[PDB]
Amino acid sequence: QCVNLTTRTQLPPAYTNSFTRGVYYPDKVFRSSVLHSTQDLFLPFFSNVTWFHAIHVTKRFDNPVLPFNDGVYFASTEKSNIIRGWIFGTTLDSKTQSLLIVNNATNVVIKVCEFQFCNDPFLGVYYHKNNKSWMESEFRVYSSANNCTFEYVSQPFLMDLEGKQGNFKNLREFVFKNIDGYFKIYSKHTPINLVRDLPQGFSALEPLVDLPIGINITRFQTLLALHRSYLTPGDSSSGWTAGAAAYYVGYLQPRTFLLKYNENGTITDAVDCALDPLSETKCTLKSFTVEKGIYQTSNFRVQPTESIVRFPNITNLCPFGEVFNATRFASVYAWNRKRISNCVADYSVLYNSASFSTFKCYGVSPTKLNDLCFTNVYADSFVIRGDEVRQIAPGQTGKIADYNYKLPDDFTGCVIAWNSNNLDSKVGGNYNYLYRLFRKSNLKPFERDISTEIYQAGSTPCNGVEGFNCYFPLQSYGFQPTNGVGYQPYRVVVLSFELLHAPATVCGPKKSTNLVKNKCVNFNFNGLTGTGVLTESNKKFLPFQQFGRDIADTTDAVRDPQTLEILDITPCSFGGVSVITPGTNTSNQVAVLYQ
Amino acid sequence: NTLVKQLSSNFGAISSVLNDILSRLDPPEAEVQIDRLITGRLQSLQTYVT
C-alpha cells in the first residue's frame, strides 16, 4: 500500500476487568429525587475488556482497525497527550464516506470525505536540540483528498504538545453511539493520579457533540503520534517513539441501569438490572435498601440449541410453462381449471419466465409462500380486458366479477395479471374470446356457466328468435394494437390453496435434516413452526388426520411425513424463580429458590 | 377450565394460534390481530381477577 514501520514486537493482548464505566445521561430531561429506568446502550458492570499497551519511553506500537458495533466505550489513561485522532469508515479505500476527527495543535478538524488511508496512518512531530519547540512533520494519514461531504475547522489555539515521562495523570472517557444516523459523542475528563491498571470510582458523563451525519460506519481506528529527536537512530522507517499511555476499547450492549438522581440532578449511583438477584430486587423495587422477604422473578426458560427441519421428500417440480405465459387460453365465462399437486412449488421461478404486471395474494404474504405447505392448488386461468382487471378482487363490484367469475369474501389465494399483446392481438381483431353481458341471477363461488340461451331484458317473450328486448349474452371483445393500453388483453390466473387444513404434499423446497429427541429445540412440520421436545407417543391416529388438538387448542401430537410416526410436543417453559433476602443492612447474600 | 378454553377463542380473527398467524402473514400486517387478541385476553384476565 504505502509505507510501514519495522521492529514492532507486538505483545499478545490481555483481558482485564472494568469498574463501573459507561454511565451517561439518557436524554436532555432533568430528573431530581426520582429513580427512572431507561433502555439505551451502556456497558455491563464487571465486564471483561481488552487492554492494549503503548509504552515505549519497550518497543510497543499496535493500533489495528476495530469493528464498530452498537456503541463504543474508549478509555484513555495519558500524561502527555499520546492519543491523537480517530477515523471511522467501512472499507477505507476511497470508495466510502470516511470520517476523520483530529485534534491538531492548531485546530480541531472534522472531515467527512473519501480519504485514501494507508496500512499504518499516524502523525509525528520533531523536537530540536538547539531550540525548544514542538513542530509537526510526518503526516502519514491520507495521500490525497478529492471528494468531501462535510468539513469543520475549530478556532485557532495554542497547544503545549507535552512529551514527559512518569505516571498517568489524565483520564479521558468517550462514548460513541449512532442513532438514526445521528452520531453522538460524549466526552469526560478526569485529573487522576495513579501508576497503571484502571482507576476505580464513579463519575458522570457529559455530552460532547451530536453530528447529524448519515453514513454507514462499520469499523474505526485510532491514530496516535510519534516523537523524533536525538534518541532516534536517524531514520523515519525504523526509529519511532510511541510514548507511554494506555487505552481500553469496549463494546456497548443494550442493558438497563437505574440511576440515582439527587437534588442537584446529577447521576451519582448506577444499579444494574440483570446481574445479581439483589440487583434485580433493587431494580424492581426502585430503591436501594431491600427489606427482609421473598420476591418472585422471571420464569425459567431453556434456550434452544438446534433446529430440525422435517419435510417429505418430493422430487417432481410443478410445471410453470403451461400455467404462466403459455400459448392460448379460454374465455372468461369458461375459465381453464388446473390441478397442481405432488410437486414442489416456488415463486422465485416465475420472475425469469415472463415479466408480469400485477401480483397480489389475499390472506397470505407473497414472500412467505415457501415457508408453508400448499394444500389443493387450483389454477383458474382466463383472459380479460384491461378495463376490468380491478374488478377481479374479493370485495368489488362490476359485471365481470358478478356474471362470470366469483370470489368469496374470505378467499385466501394469489392473483396474477399480465399483458399479452404479442399473441392475443391481431391486425384485424381477435374474435376468439367471449364474455357474458347480463344474467338473471348471480353466480356461486367457483362455478362455470356455459348457458348459451337467449337472454330476456324485460317484456316481450323471445322463444328463441332474438327480437325485441332479446339480446345475446356472449359478446366479443376488440383486442387491437392500434387502441390504448386499457383495450389490450390481459391474462389473469388465480391460484387458490389451503393453509394447514388437510394432509397434502406440495410444501416447499426446504430439505429435511436429522432428528434429535429429549431436547427443547425448534421444529417445523408442514409449514407449522414450534418449539419444544418431541417425545415418543403411544396413541392411535387415523389415516386422514395429521395434526392433533386437545382442549387447549394446541398441536399436541404431530405425524412425521417420512417415518410416519406420532410425536408428542412438550414445552419446557415450566418453573418459577424466587429470591429470598434477609435485608440490605444485614448482609449482601441472598437465596435462590426453584419452585 | 374457562381460562383454558379462552385460548381457543378468536375475538374476531381467523385463528387462535399465534404461530399459525405469524407463519401465514407478514409481521407488518398481523399487528392489529395481535392487538385484538391481547386486548381480549387482558379483558378476560381482568374479569377473572375481579
Binding site: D550, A552, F574, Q595 | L3, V4, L7
Partner: peptide, 28 residues
Amino acid sequence: PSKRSFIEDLLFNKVTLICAQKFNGLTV
C-alpha cells in the same frame, strides 16, 4: 399414619389437566 383421629379421617375422605393448566401460566 398421620396425627388425626377417626372422625377427622372420615371428614377428610368426603372432601375431594394439571400440567395442561400449568403450561400456560396458571400455577398453584
